Design a protein around this ligand. Structure first.
Ligand SMILES: CN1C(=O)[C@@H](N2CCc3c(nn(Cc4ccccc4)c3Cl)C2=O)COc2cc(C#N)ccc21
Length: 267
């Protein structure tokens, strides 16, 4: 019952989303996931999973604050982050300075390392799922419910993304189990996007052409990064988008290089 909220508890981009303010805690974001008839037998599963992901407390990971389970409405509640996702921030009129970009990355590394410690594999890491608060600090999100079996099915019910960050072992092979190294690939392409200030592959249509190109070893154009980018970061993104997953490092491994690096070079 601890993660159960309801509409009467509440006063009242992104999508079909509404802002809200609960009594005790500060400001919150609410999204309605499903509208339709009551599945009922698939409710105990929804709450058990809602409390399982409520356990994920990290300053760089979005916390599920609660879930509204009413007659027809099924909704989720999360922490507020005012600057939006990382891309919208990167595409802004004012440029984000190097030192900020470095911290952002360190924050992404920490949050992914915490999730891998708890056993959660993100599956859909990208700039849309990196949320930014007022002081340019970040939290890792999952706006497409990729890590939440039951709630995603609830979203994709009868009665109710972008492949640029996906590891090539998952492209055209849907039956392969995502590993911790799958996120490491995605992280690499995020690193590109950060210093390129845009989505990769000229934001071109997700063709069979592009999929086979990536499976054969093509990557985002490093030459397209026109602003200054530290060599340590260029080395890391190339290391992390290696075709062979064994060649990619682990997020604990990444943090050990990068934390000492950020503090001296970038901060
Ligand atoms: C309101 N809202 C959400 O709460 C949101 N959501 C659920 C809870 C949650 C979230 N990320 N985490 C951290 C995390 C845990 C494991 C793996 C990866 C990350 C946790 Cl835990 C998260 O992004 C889902 O639905 C939305 C969709 C849209 C759109 N479109 C907007 C808002 C929400």
């Amino acid at each position: 019952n601890v993660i159960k909220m309801k509409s009467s508890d509440f006063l009242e981009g992104f999508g079909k989303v509404s802002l809200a303010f609960h009594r005790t805690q500060g400001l919150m974001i609410m999204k309605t996931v499903y509208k339709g008839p009551n599945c009922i037998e698939h409710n105990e599963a929804l709450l058990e999973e809602a409390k399982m992901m409520n356990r994920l407390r990290h300053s760089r990971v979005v916390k599920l604050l609660g879930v509204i389970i009413e007659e027809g409405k099924y909704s989720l509640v999360m922490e507020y982050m005012e600057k939006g996702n990382l891309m919208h921030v990167l595409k802004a009129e004012m440029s984000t300075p190097l030192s900020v970009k470095g911290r952002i990355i360190l924050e992404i590394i920490e949050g992914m390392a915490y999730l891998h410690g708890k056993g959660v594999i993100h599956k859909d890491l990208k700039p849309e799922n990196i949320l930014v608060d007022n002081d340019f600090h970040i939290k890792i999100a999952d706006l497409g419910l990729a890590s939440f079996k039951m709630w995603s099915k609830l979203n994709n019910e009868e009665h109710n993304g972008t492949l640029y960050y996906m590891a090539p072992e998952h492209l055209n092979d849907v039956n392969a189990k995502p590993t911790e190294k799958s996120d490491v690939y995605s992280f690499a392409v995020v690193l590109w996007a950060i210093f390129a200030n845009k989505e990769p592959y000229e934001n071109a249509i997700a063709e069979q052409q592009l999929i086979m190109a990536i499976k054969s070893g093509n990557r985002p154009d490093v030459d397209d990064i026109t602003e200054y980018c530290p060599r340590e970061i260029i080395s890391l993104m190339k290391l992390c988008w290696e075709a062979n997953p064994e060649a990619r490092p682990t997020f604990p491994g990444i943090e050990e290089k990068f934390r000492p690096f950020y503090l001296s070079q970038l901060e």
